[PDB]
Symmetry: C3
């Protein structure tokens, strides 16, 4: 089902958003 | 609708490439 | 096209896991 893929993609967009913020916190808190 | 998903996936592929490069840099500067 | 989307989403999920893991390593090496 298409629904199946839509749920996985929704999860991937949320994971990506979170990862982006983590990368920002790390490059700020000297993770350079 | 399928087009809708294809576009979201293409954007996720682009964002993932960018993040992998950011992570790679972060890593080199810490090690 | 459907099989193609499934393949790309599988690649994206694997990439997401690797990035998350690398970021978790970096929280060790930055501290």
């Amino acid at each position: 089902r298409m629904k199946q893929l839509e749920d996985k993609v929704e999860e991937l967009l949320s994971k990506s958003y979170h990862l982006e913020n983590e990368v920002a916190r790390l490059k700020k808190l000297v993770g350079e």
